[PDB]
């Protein structure tokens, strides 16, 4: 059930990536869509939901479309009152053709029953390993009991870009990186933090890993960020 951890050879290497690492940084550096109590208004493909959500900080969109793994997830949430949290993109964001528009994947949670009885916020510790040493540890926060892994991942990388220079314009000071979640039923899963090898970063394709809408229990999940400089 749980995903095996990284094999050494499969992790993406920043030395094999020849595009602009600022195109990855852009997805996580104080950049996310956020909304409360919205209900989808429209669809494009059978697995996606379009919401009326307005860009809260820069004035770039009044529509957002999320793509989900399958038509079942889309039906489940179509008429639910939901909260939205996730990373958006504009390159190759295909809508029909019928006030900017932005795209994304997953990020949706039912609002009702999903907040803490106190109105308080749940702190979630991220432990950071560099060349296998737990170097620093820091907390992100959420108001949600059952929170997307996407939302936690975005918060963690936002911090690390400022604190650790996780991504810079040209490249990264790290060669490899993966973020691992560990749930209190023992389940584990992880996301490669580095772009696929090549001379072009594909935003849409990279973000597509969040389409499963995976949620985790904020009060109990543990998170590990594992980074190497290993090459230099």
Q: Which residues are annotated as a binding site?
A: 9, 47, 71, 80, 83, 111-112, 115
Give binding residues for Zn(2+) as ranges. 9, 47, 71, 80, 83, 111-112, 115
The residue among 154 and 194 lying less far from Zn ion, judged by its C-beta, is: 154
DSSP track, 33-74 = EEEEEE---B-SSTTEEEE----SSS---SEEEEE-SSHHHH
Residue of 61, 73, 76, 144 lying closest to 105 (CA atoms): 73
**Interface with Zn ion includes 145 (CB under 5 A)?**
no
**Interface with Zn ion includes 110 (CB under 5 A)?**
no
CB of 111 to Zn ion, least distance (A): 4
Give the span between the Cα atoms of 96 and 98, in whole angstroms.
Answer: 6
Residue of 214, 154, 152, 142 lying closest to 27 (CA atoms): 154
- Closest chain position to Zn ion (CB): 111
The residue among 83 and 151 lying less far from Zn ion, judged by its C-beta, is: 83
> Which residues are bridge partners to 182 per DSSP?
188, 222
Q: Which of 48, 83, 175, 224 binds Zn ion (CB under 5 A)?
A: 83
**Interface with Zn ion includes 111 (CB under 5 A)?**
yes
The residue among 45 and 81 lying less far from Zn ion, judged by its C-beta, is: 81
Q: What is the DSSP letter of 16?
A: G
Q: Which residues in this chain contact Zn ion in the complex, by CB under 5 A?
A: 83, 111
């Amino acid at each position: 059930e749980s995903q095996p951890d990284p094999t050494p050879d499969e992790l993406h290497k920043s030395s094999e990536f020849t595009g602009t690492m600022g195109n990855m940084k852009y997805l996580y550096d104080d950049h996310y869509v956020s909304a409360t109590k919205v209900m989808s208004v429209d669809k494009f493909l059978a697995h996606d939901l379009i919401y009326n959500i307005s860009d809260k900080k820069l004035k770039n969109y009044d529509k957002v479309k999320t793509e989900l793994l399958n038509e079942d997830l889309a039906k489940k949430y179509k008429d639910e009152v939901v909260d939205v949290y996730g990373s958006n993109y504009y390159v190759n964001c295909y809508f029909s053709s019928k006030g900017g528009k932005t795209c994304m994947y997953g990020g949706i949670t039912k609002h009702e029953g999903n907040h803490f009885d106190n109105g308080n916020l749940q702190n979630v510790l991220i432990r950071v390993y560099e060349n296998k040493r737990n170097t620093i540890s820091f907390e992100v926060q959420t108001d949600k009991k059952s929170v997307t892994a996407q939302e936690l991942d975005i918060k963690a990388r936002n911090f690390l870009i400022n604190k650790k220079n996780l991504y810079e314009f040209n490249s990264s000071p790290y060669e490899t990186g993966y973020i691992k979640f560990i749930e209190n039923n023992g389940n584990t899963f992880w996301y490669d933090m580095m772009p696929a090898p090549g001379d072009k970063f594909d935003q849409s394709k990279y973000l597509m890993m969040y389409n499963d809408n995976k949620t985790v229990d904020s009060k109990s999940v543990k998170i590990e960020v594992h980074l190497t400089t290993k090459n230099g």
